[PDB]
Amino acid sequence: MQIFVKTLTGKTITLEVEPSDTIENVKAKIQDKEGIPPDQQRLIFAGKQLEDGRTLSDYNIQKESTLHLVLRLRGG
């Protein structure tokens, strides 16, 4: 499937992944592309922090809205 990643700078970039994919994975993707370390960033979805070891599938059932990820920065 696919997911939309909303950066803090106001930029939007789509990500291709599998529902059985882990978070650490989706992270490794965004990292490699934006050079952002999982430490300086926090993943927020539906007001719930993504577990460093869960699958999107768990987050697929709880499809309250559409697939959109908000990137939070520790700085500022």
Side-chain angles (χ1 to χ4, degrees):
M1 58 191 201
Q2 49 284 106
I3 60 174
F4 289 89
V5 170
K6 195 172 177 291
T7 68
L8 184 138
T9 298
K11 296 181 181 179
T12 294
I13 189 187
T14 305
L15 227 78
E16 289 171 357
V17 61
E18 294 179 84
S20 65
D21 205 38
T22 61
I23 313 311
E24 45 172 90
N25 191 275
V26 179
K27 301 234 288 184
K29 276 160 186 292
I30 288 165
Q31 177 167 188
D32 289 330
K33 302 174 173 181
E34 309 187 319
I36 302 178
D39 290 348
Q40 290 178 194
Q41 56 187 16
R42 294 273 181 167
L43 310 195
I44 309 305
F45 177 91
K48 306 163 62 46
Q49 287 172 345
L50 290 302
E51 201 191 270
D52 314 47
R54 281 275 182 72
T55 59
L56 284 71
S57 298
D58 188 83
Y59 289 98
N60 182 62
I61 295 168
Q62 304 186 351
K63 192 168 189 179
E64 293 187 356
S65 198
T66 312
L67 314 179
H68 54 77
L69 172 55
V70 171
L71 195 76
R72 282 203 72 79
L73 274 62
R74 192 188 183 283

